[PDB]
Amino acid sequence: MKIIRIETSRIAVPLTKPFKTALRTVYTAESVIVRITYDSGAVGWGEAPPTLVITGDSMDSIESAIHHVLKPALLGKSLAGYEAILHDIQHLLTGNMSAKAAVEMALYDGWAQMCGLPLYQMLGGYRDTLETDYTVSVNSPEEMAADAENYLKQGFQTLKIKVGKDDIATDIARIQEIRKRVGSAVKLRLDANQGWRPKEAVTAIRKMEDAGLGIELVEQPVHKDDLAGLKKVTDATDTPIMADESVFTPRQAFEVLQTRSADLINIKLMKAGGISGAEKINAMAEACGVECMVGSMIETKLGITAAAHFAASKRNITRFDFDAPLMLKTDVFNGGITYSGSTISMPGKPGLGIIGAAL
Amino acid sequence: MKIIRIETSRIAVPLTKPFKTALRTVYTAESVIVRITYDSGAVGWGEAPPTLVITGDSMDSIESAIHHVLKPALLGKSLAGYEAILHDIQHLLTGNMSAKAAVEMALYDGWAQMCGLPLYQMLGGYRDTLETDYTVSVNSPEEMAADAENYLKQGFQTLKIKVGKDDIATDIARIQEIRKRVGSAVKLRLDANQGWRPKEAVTAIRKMEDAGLGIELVEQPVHKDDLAGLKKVTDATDTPIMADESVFTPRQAFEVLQTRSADLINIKLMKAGGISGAEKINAMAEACGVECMVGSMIETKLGITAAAHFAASKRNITRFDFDAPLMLKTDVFNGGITYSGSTISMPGKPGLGIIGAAL
Amino acid sequence: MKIIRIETSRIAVPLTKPFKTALRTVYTAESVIVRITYDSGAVGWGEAPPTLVITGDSMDSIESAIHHVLKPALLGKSLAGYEAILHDIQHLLTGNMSAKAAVEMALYDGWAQMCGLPLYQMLGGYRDTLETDYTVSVNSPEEMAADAENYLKQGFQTLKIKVGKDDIATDIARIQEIRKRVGSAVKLRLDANQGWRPKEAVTAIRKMEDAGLGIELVEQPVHKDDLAGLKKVTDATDTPIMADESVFTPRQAFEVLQTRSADLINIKLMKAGGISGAEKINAMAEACGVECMVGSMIETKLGITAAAHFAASKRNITRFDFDAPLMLKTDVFNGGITYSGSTISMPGKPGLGIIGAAL
Amino acid sequence: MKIIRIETSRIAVPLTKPFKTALRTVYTAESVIVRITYDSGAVGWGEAPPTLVITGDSMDSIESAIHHVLKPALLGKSLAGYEAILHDIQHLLTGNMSAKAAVEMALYDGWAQMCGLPLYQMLGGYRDTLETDYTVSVNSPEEMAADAENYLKQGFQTLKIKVGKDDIATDIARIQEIRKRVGSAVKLRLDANQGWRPKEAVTAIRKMEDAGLGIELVEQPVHKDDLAGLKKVTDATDTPIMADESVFTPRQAFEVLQTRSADLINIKLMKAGGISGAEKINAMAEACGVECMVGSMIETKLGITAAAHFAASKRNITRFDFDAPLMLKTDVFNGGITYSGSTISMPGKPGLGIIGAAL
Ligand SMILES: [Mg+2]
Ligand SMILES: [Mg+2]
Ligand SMILES: [Mg+2]
Ligand SMILES: [Mg+2]
């Protein structure tokens, strides 16, 4: 079992290098941290960063949401009736998806703790390890290529290249400089972050294909609301197109799957309001032959631990984008998932396996 | 929790009175029962009856499938990796949805026994009681009206009325003679079990609406594959139309929801290959703003216990159709859910709470 | 002009009688008051209340969005370039529509002040006065009838009846008591606040038509996301259907107009993120032959004042729902619009006509 | 504010050389000029030329409509109620859009003058400068390459190439010869002015794509009433298609956007009946995520100034086609915008900044 306390606190950990996308730049990772204590003494953990240009959630909005709305309705409830709690978390307020997701992470932590198994095993237990990409931030062709060379040196053979921030011809210059420096063996994932127009993206993606640049997929090439435009890019190229900002919820997912506007979907807990929605998105996509990748916002190893446990559980989730914690100057959590280069291994303790604040 | 043994065995229980729909007549309920023994000594339980005109599964087809295909893939497997087991169950053979389902009930029974809670609570535990309807089998207008009076006396204020066997005129005459004899307070569901052409249906449904006969919903008025025809009935009436035989799988549900060919869905474990599919259908429907009913085939209390635990677990499952065990001369199962009038209660025992066969 | 300072504060003013709809109950009116100071020393005013179940906006989320995001991009900007300002307001953060709206109210106030005319004349100046309705909150039939009789005595011949909270039969009994008590001369607006299913709503609206209850229109009978269901009710009845929670933004309005899912649109500043988006929603709607009503959330005379100025300016805005400030124990603003019973009159000052805090 | 007098006159400025399109040839630019005199002594200015094969408007029909229909509704009205004046302009007669537009120009000129700001700032003031293209008229492949070379020398790096007059073969040869003589750095816009069948159009655009001729976009490739053919070109090429003569009004834009029959829209004051309609088209397109160009007919600086004040005001307007006045032998207005090679600049005077006629 039973919820009996919900607390929050803040963390702020500067990034080593600034993370740069077409939407935003981030110098310091901010995050609200949620702790649910249950009647057994056991503690469930949770996280939500501010993403004002993606979800609209600020640190203030989240902490308010959790204390004023979610907390009064959750105190005293049992994990034996977790469906009623999930419904409450998702319908006692509209929007506020990052708040809902922090609370759901702690909830699933204690639920698997209650059942006595690691959370990823509780949800299907499909794999014990998984490979994460590393993100190359948008910068000059030269900076991006040296970033990529170093990430390959750290053990990462799959790089996620941010593009779409200014003009398209420079994006191509960026990829060629990365390819000419790193070799044609490594997998390159593009993410345009809504920065291209559909016909523009088609022409550029064919140009990259034809130059043998070896693009694995392209994330959300067009504006999130332009579903028909996304379909156009998907239908026009040989390169897999992955919806991201287009699909937050199950309802939005259903719309993308039915129109067939994309080949892959990017699932994030912040977007889906936690694991319950992420799981619903993946299942619906699995039935349509649509594979999913699980990523994150700029989050600590906590929120990546929740994401990895969910991503680890499902057969249909075949890619993983869990590089955020490696971007920070310090690791502010004890336990959870462990990295070994690109390989993320799952823990053995019941739940998320997050012991607590690091030292 | 390792699976070490898979046992099957048959039963045969008479029906007090024959069960009559537009597709079939049942005099005796026959069923394959599955028992999965785990390395803990725990036993998980499952059921699948033959429904040759519905699923095409027979007792021979079901047993063969379980022993020649599913059993070799489940022995040695643990329940900490159920995603891979569920996938094997659904993909190592096509169709055979009844046999897949028996094995899934026992698997989920096992999985919930491992975590020390009732199965319904493991799947969400939204409610612990629920109201079942009772089915008025197709007969003469007088013969059906008697049955209706008698079920109301037993405490069943929601009656499901089988139609679609004969012609329209007699169907309207049956609902009249039922309404007359039972007053305008009790809920009346209809279930044509595919017996009407789309035109026939619109005409018959509208006639009833204008006569004030108060029909809650009509199940599958037309042929299961006539999807456009299901939609025409949905869109030309003011009565909720529930898909049944047109929706077995999550892919079939997705198509029905996308085209909006119906307002509701009937989920059965037999049709959906077990619980994993049932859950996926309901979750899709929920994402589209559509509630579901969970019913069954002619099953004993064991199969109804599995269906009830699933139905009890989800907010978006709001109607229940678990009258089948009450048609039988004997209740051949000890433990499981409990009837008391129209009310079914979820016991506090772990798993499905089946102790064994009756004495 | 130029923006030189942006400040916020809060008010909290009890309701005389509790406001009740199918979504929420409100006992006290809370709100954030924005104050933009310009280089001439002139001040522009705005407002946003929390509506956590409608917009997702809380007082903490609003205040934080203003100070952390909108203020540092507005400071030093001229109302000569107000389109870049409006684009920044809308695109610097996703969501936060109530925060965007409150700032937009103060921007438009300042912009009209500059031009030396009342805001409503700067925006078109179509009428000097307008008739507001008064909302009868959801209670028992007798309480709703008593309220309605008293609202008529205070001079309100157009009443807005909140239905949709419980079961439909009780709703018809409410309208019936109100009609029997107030006579057939008054105009009766209904608002179900998403409370009805599509088919249930159709049958219920025709029942009211048949019974001669003389319903002017029905606001958002069904869930916001179910546009096709909203379309079904629009097409099935003779009674005008108005979209409300279905239409926040110009883009959402485009979708409701393209699909023809409603005869009318309810515009609110909180939903559209201000007046610019509100203005666009009305313009598209006029081009489609679709009249609009402008309402509000539970807001003081300040936010109603901005809403009325917008509302008075445009020909296609033919209905008005500005009763919220009359529900409050105290009128906490000085100036702005004035009431004589149900009649609202626009002020002659440049801008909104809001002097300051009340005596 | 008050309108006290509406005067009209004609002018005829020679064109240095002929403007040629698929639709028409223009040797001399004739125009009706509207001055509106307000009770302050302020004078607003407007222009409408005759475009018999585009709008159907002639000088007699413009003057007639202004004097018989529009003037009687305008005299004695004040700009504090511009919404009602605008509505009388658009609805007291059907068609006569060039007449509507000329009067709107003088009205908006007056409105901006009452508030002491340039019109462009009054409507939003997004930008101060803008780059106009220059139009290469239809002649022989050689003559068009010489014009293009010359225009690049005069500062114009963006060229609009008129095509569609005779046949495909020659059109292609013109773009190739222009490309040769001008290099691949300069931007190339085509405008076919309704001169291609849809199949013909796809073929020719596809030939140019494969020959690497770098076509930014194509204006109205097909007949203006042929909406489905416009959509076929749009959907079978990777080159943006911009609707022109297809889209006069908000209603027409709404349909084009609804069906996605084009990627872009050309807005002209003459087609929209003025700025109120142009503003409405631009806002609709913004809601659908589509940018617009603003153009003109063959107009003098007065009409280009009014268009450029609109185009400068809105963010979503990102292309500009204001070359007509430069094709003329004499500049017969002092004031207005100013040219500087390809750069158009917005004056600082209230309203259009037009002082008066030629010396
Ligand atoms: Mg992405
Ligand atoms: Mg059925
Ligand atoms: Mg409403
Ligand atoms: Mg053109």
Side-chain angles (χ1 to χ4, degrees), chain D residues 82-146:
Chain D
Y82 71 88
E83 170 98 341
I85 297 168
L86 283 186
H87 193 228
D88 283 326
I89 287 172
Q90 292 312 312
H91 293 255
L92 285 175
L93 72 180
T94 186
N96 297 277
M97 306 305 278
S98 302
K100 287 157 166 168
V103 173
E104 275 221 19
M105 287 175 174
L107 195 80
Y108 269 96
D109 188 359
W111 180 68
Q113 283 189 63
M114 172 190 73
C115 319
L117 283 138
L119 179 56
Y120 87 97
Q121 288 173 355
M122 210 85 297
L123 307 168
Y126 189 75
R127 67 179 67 74
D128 282 22
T129 43
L130 38 97
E131 170 191 11
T132 184
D133 59 26
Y134 208 98
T135 298
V136 183
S137 290
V138 177
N139 279 296
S140 76
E142 176 68 2
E143 227 185 312
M144 291 182 80

Side-chain angles (χ1 to χ4, degrees), chain D residues 123-302:
Chain D
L123 307 168
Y126 189 75
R127 67 179 67 74
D128 282 22
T129 43
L130 38 97
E131 170 191 11
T132 184
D133 59 26
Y134 208 98
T135 298
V136 183
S137 290
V138 177
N139 279 296
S140 76
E142 176 68 2
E143 227 185 312
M144 291 182 80
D147 286 343
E149 190 189 331
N150 171 16
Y151 297 150
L152 179 54
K153 268 153 79 212
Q154 290 213 255
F156 302 90
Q157 290 211 118
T158 311
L159 311 195
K160 169 164 167 168
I161 305 309
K162 292 284 161 176
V163 298
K165 201 199 176 152
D166 15 56
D167 73 310
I168 290 300
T170 328
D171 282 334
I172 307 239
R174 290 146 172 167
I175 312 320
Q176 295 215 67
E177 192 64 61
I178 286 159
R179 250 295 114 101
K180 193 154 107 49
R181 204 99 116 252
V182 85
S184 66
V186 307
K187 267 237 210 90
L188 287 183
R189 251 160 220 171
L190 316 194
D191 182 356
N193 287 296
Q194 306 177 67
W196 293 337
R197 290 163 269 98
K199 186 159 189 173
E200 215 190 350
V202 167
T203 299
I205 292 165
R206 280 237 199 78
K207 223 156 275 197
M208 291 173 203
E209 264 167 22
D210 294 359
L213 296 173
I215 304 312
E216 181 189 20
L217 58 90
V218 185
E219 281 186 69
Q220 198 64 44
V222 296
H223 181 76
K224 71 172 192 292
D225 303 326
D226 192 8
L227 187 62
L230 186 78
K231 187 178 173 56
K232 172 139 80 279
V233 177
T234 294
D235 285 338
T237 65
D238 297 334
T239 306
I241 303 311
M242 176 176 297
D244 180 358
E245 299 94 319
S246 260
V247 178
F248 274 53
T249 63
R251 178 90 195 75
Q252 273 163 335
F254 186 90
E255 170 114 320
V256 158
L257 297 159
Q258 148 178 53
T259 62
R260 308 176 123 77
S261 291
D263 302 290
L264 300 168
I265 291 162
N266 184 319
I267 300 165
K268 290 178 197 39
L269 299 193
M270 278 326 105
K271 296 186 316 181
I275 295 154
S276 70
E279 183 166 56
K280 281 166 185 160
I281 290 160
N282 177 246
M284 249 179 230
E286 196 183 55
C288 300
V290 171
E291 300 182 348
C292 295
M293 183 165 93
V294 180
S296 61
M297 307 297 183
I298 291 308
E299 287 163 52
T300 71
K301 179 171 73 195
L302 162 52

Side-chain angles (χ1 to χ4, degrees), chain C residues 43-213:
Chain C
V43 178
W45 298 73
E47 164 169 20
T51 47
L52 284 123
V53 307
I54 302 158
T55 52
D57 300 316
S58 72
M59 291 213 285
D60 287 358
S61 83
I62 288 160
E63 278 211 291
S64 175
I66 280 150
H67 293 293
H68 295 292
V69 188
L70 303 188
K71 177 178 69 177
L74 297 224
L75 281 184
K77 297 303 200 282
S78 184
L79 302 176
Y82 74 90
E83 164 100 346
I85 288 167
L86 292 168
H87 190 254
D88 272 354
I89 287 159
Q90 298 294 305
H91 298 259
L92 285 175
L93 75 175
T94 189
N96 294 272
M97 305 297 290
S98 305
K100 295 173 175 151
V103 168
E104 254 207 46
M105 293 183 188
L107 196 81
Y108 270 94
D109 191 7
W111 173 80
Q113 278 187 53
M114 174 165 79
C115 302
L117 288 173
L119 182 50
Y120 84 100
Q121 286 174 355
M122 290 302 302
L123 291 181
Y126 194 76
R127 61 185 66 81
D128 298 316
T129 63
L130 54 89
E131 210 216 328
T132 172
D133 62 16
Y134 206 105
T135 298
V136 183
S137 297
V138 204
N139 286 288
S140 74
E142 172 72 10
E143 171 150 36
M144 291 184 80
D147 281 339
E149 200 171 77
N150 173 44
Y151 300 158
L152 187 56
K153 287 156 61 245
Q154 285 183 224
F156 294 83
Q157 285 165 107
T158 299
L159 315 188
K160 181 175 155 150
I161 315 307
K162 291 281 182 183
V163 296
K165 178 159 190 203
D166 33 83
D167 73 277
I168 245 299
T170 320
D171 286 330
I172 301 159
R174 289 148 164 151
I175 306 321
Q176 280 253 64
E177 201 70 6
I178 287 163
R179 272 261 94 96
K180 195 131 63 51
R181 189 82 139 272
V182 84
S184 75
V186 318
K187 261 194 268 138
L188 287 185
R189 238 158 250 173
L190 304 185
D191 187 347
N193 280 296
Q194 300 172 78
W196 299 335
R197 283 169 262 111
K199 284 168 188 209
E200 148 186 56
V202 168
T203 290
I205 290 155
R206 247 183 259 136
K207 271 181 196 180
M208 293 179 248
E209 290 173 353
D210 289 5
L213 308 189

